[PDB]
CSV table of C-alpha atoms and ligand atoms in Angstrom, one decimal:
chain,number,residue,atom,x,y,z
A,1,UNK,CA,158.4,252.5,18.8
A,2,UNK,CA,159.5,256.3,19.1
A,3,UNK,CA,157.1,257.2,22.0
A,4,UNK,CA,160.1,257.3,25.1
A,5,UNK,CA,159.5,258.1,29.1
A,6,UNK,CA,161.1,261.7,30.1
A,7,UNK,CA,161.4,262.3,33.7
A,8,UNK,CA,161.6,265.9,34.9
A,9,UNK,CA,165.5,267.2,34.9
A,10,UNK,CA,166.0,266.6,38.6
A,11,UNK,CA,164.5,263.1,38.2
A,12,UNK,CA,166.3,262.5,34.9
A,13,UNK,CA,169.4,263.6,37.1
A,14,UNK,CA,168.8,262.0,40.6
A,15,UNK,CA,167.4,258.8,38.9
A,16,UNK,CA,171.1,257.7,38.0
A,17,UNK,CA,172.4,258.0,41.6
A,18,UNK,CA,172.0,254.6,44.3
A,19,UNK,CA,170.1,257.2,46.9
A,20,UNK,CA,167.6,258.4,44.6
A,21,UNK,CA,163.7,257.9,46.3
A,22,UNK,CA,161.1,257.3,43.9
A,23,UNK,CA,159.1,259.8,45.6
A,24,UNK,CA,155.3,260.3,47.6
A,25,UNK,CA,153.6,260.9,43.8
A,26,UNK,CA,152.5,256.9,43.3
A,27,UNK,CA,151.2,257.4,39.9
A,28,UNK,CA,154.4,258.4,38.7
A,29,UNK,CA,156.2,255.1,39.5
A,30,UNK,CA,155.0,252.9,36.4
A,31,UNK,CA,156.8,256.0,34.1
A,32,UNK,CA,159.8,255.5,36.5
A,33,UNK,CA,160.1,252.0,35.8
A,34,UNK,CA,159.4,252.4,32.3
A,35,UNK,CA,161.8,255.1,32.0
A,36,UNK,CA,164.3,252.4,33.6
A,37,UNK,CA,163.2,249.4,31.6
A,38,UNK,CA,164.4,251.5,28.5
A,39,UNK,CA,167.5,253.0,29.2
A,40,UNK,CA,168.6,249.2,31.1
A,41,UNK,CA,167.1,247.0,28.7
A,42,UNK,CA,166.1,249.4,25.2
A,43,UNK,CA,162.6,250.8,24.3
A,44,UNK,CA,162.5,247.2,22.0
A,45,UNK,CA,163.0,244.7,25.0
A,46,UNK,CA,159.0,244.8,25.5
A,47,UNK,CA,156.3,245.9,24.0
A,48,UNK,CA,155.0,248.7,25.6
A,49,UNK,CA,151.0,248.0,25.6
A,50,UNK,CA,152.0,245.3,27.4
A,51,UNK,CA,154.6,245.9,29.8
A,52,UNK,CA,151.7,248.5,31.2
A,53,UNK,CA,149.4,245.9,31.5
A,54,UNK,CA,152.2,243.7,33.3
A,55,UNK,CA,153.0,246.9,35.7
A,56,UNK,CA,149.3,247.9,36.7
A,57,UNK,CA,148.4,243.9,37.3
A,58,UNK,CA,152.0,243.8,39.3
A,59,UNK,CA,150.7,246.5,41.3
A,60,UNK,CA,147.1,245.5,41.8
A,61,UNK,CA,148.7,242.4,43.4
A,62,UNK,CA,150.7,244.5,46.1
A,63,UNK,CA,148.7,245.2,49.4
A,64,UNK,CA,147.9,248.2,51.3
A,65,UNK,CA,150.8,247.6,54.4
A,66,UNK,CA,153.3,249.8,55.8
A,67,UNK,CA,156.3,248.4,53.9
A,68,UNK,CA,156.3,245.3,51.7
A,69,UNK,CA,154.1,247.5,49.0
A,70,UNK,CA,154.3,248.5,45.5
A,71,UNK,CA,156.8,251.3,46.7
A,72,UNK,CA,159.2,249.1,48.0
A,73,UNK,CA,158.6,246.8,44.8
A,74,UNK,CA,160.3,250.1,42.9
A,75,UNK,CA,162.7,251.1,45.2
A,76,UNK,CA,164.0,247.6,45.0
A,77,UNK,CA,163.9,248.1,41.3
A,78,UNK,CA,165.2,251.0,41.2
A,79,UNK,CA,168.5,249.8,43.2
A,80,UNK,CA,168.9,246.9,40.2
A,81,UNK,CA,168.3,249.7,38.0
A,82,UNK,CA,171.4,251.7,39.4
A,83,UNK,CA,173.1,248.6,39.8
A,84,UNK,CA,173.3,247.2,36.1
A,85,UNK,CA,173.8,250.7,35.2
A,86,UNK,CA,177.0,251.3,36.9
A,87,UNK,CA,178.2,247.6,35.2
A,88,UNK,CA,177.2,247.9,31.9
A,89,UNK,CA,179.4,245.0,30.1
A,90,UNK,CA,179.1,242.3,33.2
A,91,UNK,CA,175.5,241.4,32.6
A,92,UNK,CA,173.6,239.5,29.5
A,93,UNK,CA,170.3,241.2,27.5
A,94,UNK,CA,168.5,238.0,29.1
A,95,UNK,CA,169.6,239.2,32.6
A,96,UNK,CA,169.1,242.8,32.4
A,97,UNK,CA,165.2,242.3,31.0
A,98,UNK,CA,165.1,239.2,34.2
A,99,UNK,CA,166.3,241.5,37.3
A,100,UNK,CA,164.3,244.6,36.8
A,101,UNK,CA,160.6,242.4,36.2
A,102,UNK,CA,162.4,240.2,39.2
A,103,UNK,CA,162.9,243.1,41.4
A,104,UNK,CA,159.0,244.3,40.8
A,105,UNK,CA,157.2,241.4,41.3
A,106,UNK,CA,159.7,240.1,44.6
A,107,UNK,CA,157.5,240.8,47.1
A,108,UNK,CA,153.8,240.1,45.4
A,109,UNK,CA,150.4,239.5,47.6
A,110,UNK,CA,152.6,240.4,50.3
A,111,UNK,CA,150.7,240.1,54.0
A,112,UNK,CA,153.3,241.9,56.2
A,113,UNK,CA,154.4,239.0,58.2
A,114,UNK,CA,157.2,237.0,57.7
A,115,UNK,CA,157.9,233.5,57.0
A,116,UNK,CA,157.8,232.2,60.7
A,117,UNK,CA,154.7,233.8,61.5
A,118,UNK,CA,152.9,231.8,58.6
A,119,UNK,CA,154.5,228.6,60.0
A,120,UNK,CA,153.6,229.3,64.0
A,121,UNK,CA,149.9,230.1,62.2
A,122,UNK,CA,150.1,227.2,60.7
A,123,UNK,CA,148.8,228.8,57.2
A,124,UNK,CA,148.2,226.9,54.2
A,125,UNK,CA,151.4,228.5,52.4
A,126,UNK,CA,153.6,227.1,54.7
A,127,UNK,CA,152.3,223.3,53.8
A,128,UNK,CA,152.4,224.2,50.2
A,129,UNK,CA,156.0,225.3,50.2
A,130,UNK,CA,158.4,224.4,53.6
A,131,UNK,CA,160.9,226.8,53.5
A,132,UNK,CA,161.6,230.2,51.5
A,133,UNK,CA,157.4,230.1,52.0
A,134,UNK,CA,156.5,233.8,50.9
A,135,UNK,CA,159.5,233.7,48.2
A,136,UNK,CA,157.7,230.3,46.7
A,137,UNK,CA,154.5,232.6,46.8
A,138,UNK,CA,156.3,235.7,45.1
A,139,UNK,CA,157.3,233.6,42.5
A,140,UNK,CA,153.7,231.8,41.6
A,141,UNK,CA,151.8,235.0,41.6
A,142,UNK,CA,154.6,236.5,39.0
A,143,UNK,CA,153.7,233.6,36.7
A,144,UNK,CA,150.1,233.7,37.1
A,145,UNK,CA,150.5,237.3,36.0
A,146,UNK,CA,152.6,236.1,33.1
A,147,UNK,CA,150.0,233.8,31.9
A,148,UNK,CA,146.9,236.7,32.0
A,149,UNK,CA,146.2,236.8,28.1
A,150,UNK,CA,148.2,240.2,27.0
A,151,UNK,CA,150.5,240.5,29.8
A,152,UNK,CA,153.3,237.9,28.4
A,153,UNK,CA,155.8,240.9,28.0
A,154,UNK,CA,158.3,238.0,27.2
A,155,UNK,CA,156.7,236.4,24.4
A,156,UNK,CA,158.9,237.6,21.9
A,157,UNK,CA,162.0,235.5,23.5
A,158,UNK,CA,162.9,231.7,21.9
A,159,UNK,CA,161.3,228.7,24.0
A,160,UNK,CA,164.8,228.1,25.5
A,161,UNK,CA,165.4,231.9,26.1
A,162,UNK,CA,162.2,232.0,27.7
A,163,UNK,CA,163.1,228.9,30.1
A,164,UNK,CA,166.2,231.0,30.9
A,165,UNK,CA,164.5,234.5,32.1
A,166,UNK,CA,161.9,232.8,34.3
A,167,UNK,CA,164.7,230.3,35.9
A,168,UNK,CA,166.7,233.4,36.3
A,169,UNK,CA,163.9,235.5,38.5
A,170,UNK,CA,162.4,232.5,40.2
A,171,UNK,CA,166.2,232.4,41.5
A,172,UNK,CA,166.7,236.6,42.1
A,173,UNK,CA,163.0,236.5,44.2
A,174,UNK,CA,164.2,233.1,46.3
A,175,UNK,CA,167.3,234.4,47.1
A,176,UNK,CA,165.2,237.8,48.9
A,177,UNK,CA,164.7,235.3,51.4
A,178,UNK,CA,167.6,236.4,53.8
A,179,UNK,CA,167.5,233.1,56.1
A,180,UNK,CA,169.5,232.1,52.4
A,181,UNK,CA,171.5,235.5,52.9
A,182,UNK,CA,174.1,234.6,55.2
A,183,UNK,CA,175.3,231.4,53.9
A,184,UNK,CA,175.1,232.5,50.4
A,185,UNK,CA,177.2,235.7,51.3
A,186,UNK,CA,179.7,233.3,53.3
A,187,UNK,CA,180.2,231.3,50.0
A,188,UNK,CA,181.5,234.6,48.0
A,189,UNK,CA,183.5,235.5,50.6
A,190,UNK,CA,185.1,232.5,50.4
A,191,UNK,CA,185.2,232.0,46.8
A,192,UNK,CA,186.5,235.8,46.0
A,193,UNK,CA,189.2,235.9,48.7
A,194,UNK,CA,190.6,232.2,48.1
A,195,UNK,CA,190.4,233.6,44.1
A,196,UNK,CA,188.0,230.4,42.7
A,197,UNK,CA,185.3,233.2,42.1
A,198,UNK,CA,184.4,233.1,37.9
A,199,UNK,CA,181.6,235.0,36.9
A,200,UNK,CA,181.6,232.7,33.8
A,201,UNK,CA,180.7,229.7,36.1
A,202,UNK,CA,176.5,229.9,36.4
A,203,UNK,CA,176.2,228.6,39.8
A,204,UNK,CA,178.8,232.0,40.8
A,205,UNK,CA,176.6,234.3,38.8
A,206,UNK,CA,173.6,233.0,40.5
A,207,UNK,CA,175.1,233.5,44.1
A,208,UNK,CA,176.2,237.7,42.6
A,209,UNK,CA,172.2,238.0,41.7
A,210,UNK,CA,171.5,236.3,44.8
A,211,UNK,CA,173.4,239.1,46.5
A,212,UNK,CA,172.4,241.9,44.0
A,213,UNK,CA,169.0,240.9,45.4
A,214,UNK,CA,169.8,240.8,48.8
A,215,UNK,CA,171.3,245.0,48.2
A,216,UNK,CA,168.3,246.0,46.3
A,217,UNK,CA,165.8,244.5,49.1
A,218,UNK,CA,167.4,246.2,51.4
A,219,UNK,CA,168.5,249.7,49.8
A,220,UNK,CA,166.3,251.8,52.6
A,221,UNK,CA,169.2,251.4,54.6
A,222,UNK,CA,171.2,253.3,51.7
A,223,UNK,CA,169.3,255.9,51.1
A,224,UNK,CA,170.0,259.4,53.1
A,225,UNK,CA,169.5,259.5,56.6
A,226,UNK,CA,165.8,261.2,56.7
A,227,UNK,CA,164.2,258.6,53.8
A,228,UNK,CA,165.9,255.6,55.8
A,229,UNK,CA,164.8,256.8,59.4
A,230,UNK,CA,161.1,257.5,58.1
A,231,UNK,CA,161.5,253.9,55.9
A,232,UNK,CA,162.3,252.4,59.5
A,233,UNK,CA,159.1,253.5,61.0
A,234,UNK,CA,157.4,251.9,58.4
A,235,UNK,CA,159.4,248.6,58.5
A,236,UNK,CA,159.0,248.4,62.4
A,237,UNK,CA,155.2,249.1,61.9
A,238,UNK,CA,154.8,245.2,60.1
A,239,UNK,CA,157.2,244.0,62.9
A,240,UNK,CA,155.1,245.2,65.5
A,241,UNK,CA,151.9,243.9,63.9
A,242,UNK,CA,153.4,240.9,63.7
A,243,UNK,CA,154.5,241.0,66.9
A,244,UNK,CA,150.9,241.2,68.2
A,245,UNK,CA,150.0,238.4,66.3
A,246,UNK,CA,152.7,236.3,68.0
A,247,UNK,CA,151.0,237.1,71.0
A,248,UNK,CA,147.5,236.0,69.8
A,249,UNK,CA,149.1,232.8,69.1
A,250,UNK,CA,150.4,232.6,73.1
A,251,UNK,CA,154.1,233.6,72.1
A,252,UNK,CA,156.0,236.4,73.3
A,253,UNK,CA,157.5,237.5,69.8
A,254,UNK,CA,161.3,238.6,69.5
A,255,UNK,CA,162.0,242.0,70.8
A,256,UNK,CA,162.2,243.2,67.6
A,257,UNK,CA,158.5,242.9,67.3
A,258,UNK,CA,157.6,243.5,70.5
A,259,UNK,CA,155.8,247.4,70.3
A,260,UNK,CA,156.2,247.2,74.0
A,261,UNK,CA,160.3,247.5,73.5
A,262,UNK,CA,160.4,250.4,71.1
A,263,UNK,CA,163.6,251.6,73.3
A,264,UNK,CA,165.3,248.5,71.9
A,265,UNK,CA,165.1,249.6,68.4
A,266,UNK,CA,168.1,251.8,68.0
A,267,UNK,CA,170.4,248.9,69.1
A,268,UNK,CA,168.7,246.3,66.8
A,269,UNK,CA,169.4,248.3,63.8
A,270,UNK,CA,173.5,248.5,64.7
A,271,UNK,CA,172.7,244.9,65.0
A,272,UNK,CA,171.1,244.5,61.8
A,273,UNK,CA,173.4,247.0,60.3
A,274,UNK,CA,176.8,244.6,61.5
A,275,UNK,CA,175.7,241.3,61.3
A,276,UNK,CA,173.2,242.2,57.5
A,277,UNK,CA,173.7,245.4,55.6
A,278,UNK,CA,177.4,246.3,56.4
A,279,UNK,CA,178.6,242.5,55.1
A,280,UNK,CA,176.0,242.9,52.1
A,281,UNK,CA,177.0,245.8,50.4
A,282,UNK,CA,181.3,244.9,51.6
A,283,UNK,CA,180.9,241.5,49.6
A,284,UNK,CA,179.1,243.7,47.0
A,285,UNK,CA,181.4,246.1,46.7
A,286,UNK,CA,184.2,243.3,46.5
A,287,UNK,CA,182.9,241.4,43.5
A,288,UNK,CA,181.1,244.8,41.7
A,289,UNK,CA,183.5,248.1,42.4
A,290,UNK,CA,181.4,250.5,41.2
A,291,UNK,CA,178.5,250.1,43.9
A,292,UNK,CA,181.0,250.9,46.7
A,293,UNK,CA,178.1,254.1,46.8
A,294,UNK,CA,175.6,251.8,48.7
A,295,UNK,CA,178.5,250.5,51.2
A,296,UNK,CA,179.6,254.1,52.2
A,297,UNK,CA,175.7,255.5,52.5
A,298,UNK,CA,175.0,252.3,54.6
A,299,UNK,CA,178.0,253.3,56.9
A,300,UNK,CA,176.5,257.0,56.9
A,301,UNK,CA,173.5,255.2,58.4
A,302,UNK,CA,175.3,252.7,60.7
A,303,UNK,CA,177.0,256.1,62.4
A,304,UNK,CA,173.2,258.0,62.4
A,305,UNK,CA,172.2,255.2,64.4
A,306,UNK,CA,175.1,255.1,66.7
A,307,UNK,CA,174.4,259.3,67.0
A,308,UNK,CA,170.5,257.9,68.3
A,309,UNK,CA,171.9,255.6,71.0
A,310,UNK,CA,174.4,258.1,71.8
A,311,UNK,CA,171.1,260.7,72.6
A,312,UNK,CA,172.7,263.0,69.9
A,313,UNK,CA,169.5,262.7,68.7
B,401,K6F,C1,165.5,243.3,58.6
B,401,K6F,C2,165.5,244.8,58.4
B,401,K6F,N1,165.3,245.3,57.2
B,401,K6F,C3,165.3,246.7,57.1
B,401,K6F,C4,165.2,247.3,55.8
B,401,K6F,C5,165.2,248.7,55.7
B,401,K6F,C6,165.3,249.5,56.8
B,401,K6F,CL1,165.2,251.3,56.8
B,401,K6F,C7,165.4,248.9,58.1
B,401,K6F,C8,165.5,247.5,58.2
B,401,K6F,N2,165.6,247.0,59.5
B,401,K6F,C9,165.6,245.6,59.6
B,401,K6F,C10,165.7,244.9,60.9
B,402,MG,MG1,160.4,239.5,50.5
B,403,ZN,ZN1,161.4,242.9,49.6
């Protein structure tokens, strides 16, 4: 009950800031999300036996690929953490214990390849669950973990509290699908300029963690310029995996996956960066002032990858 997480000072510092990277030292991450857990939630929220047990299954059940790993599981974390930090009062003790085991367990039994590679494969996911496929999976295999014997870490909640925390992540890991991204985003733009938006209306609190979500998953591109750049490599190392699987199929994949236009790749992230991250974080910063941090680090970003095209470097 006594027995807290300390990070070392310039963890205990950096921790607390949106740009903070969780480091190359894996066996250190459970302590980091611990250590978050507590000061997000309260050292009482779970019981510690078995919100380890929850964390080492989560992470057994994250593969060995370049980027959708148990890494990017707590940098995604991580962002929720400085997120709800930074807007204390505006989220429940439901929501708070939801986002951070949400943000962990997004991306579980993660392949590397996205949604419409598993449909052009024709893989059995992708008859079990039509659209948001990988999402649909995210969510079963957080459940199944749920339901290991000594891994409930929410069994202390009411029946109708309980019903509320796994209705509120099987929505947070949905809305990580970003084909639901652009219309959500379109809706609180809408809704926040026009004035209807009421964060005391549940169907507009569920679109701001939809979009939460949608700023955690992609934080790499918030980070400072070297973590981001060497995040990208790893990113564009799936695509391109992907990309020869397209081709195995007899389809030329987008260019984005296509290892044989690497050139390219500086121009699709402005790309990405305009039409993704940029209106992300803006509608972000909009509705939640106090992450305007992730909106000016993504514009550091956009201009580093104008300074590539530019041959500046
Ligand atoms: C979709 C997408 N997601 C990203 C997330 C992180 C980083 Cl560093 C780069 C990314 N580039 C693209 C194209
Ligand atoms: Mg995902
Ligand atoms: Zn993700």
């Amino acid at each position: 009950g006594l027995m807290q997480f300390t990070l070392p000072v310039r963890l205990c510092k950096e921790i607390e800031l949106f740009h903070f990277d969780i480091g190359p030292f894996e066996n250190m991450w459970p302590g980091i999300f611990v250590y978050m857990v507590h000061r997000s939630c309260g050292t009482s929220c779970f019981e510690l036996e078995k919100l380890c047990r929850f964390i080492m299954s989560v992470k057994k059940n994250y593969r060995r690929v370049p980027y959708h790993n148990w890494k990017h599981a707590v940098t995604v974390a991580h962002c929720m953490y400085a997120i709800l930090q930074n807007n204390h009062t505006l989220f429940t003790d439901l929501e708070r214990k939801g986002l951070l085991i949400a943000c962990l367990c997004h991306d579980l039994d993660h392949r590397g390849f996205s949604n419409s590679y598993l449909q052009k494969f024709d893989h059995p996911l992708a008859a079990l669950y039509s659209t948001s496929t990988m999402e649909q999976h995210h969510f079963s295999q957080t459940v199944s973990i749920l339901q290991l014997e000594g891994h409930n870490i929410f069994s202390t909640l009411s029946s109708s509290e309980y019903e509320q925390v796994l209705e509120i992540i099987r929505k947070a890991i949905i809305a990580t699908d970003l084909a639901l991204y652009f219309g959500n985003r379109k809706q609180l733009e809408e809704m926040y300029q026009t004035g209807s938006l009421n964060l005391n209306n549940q169907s507009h609190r569920d679109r701001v963690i939809g979009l939460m979500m949608t700023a955690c998953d992609l934080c790499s591109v918030t980070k400072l310029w070297p973590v981001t750049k060497l995040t990208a490599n790893d990113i564009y190392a799936e695509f391109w995996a992907e990309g020869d699987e397209m081709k195995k199929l007899g389809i030329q994949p987008i260019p984005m996956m296509d290892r044989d236009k690497k050139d390219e790749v500086p121009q699709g992230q402005l790309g990405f960066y305009n039409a993704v991250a940029i209106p992300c974080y803006t509608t972000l910063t909009q509705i939640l002032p106090p992450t305007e941090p992730l909106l000016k680090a993504c514009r550091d970003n956009l201009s580093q990858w104008e300074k590539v095209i530019r041959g500046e470097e």
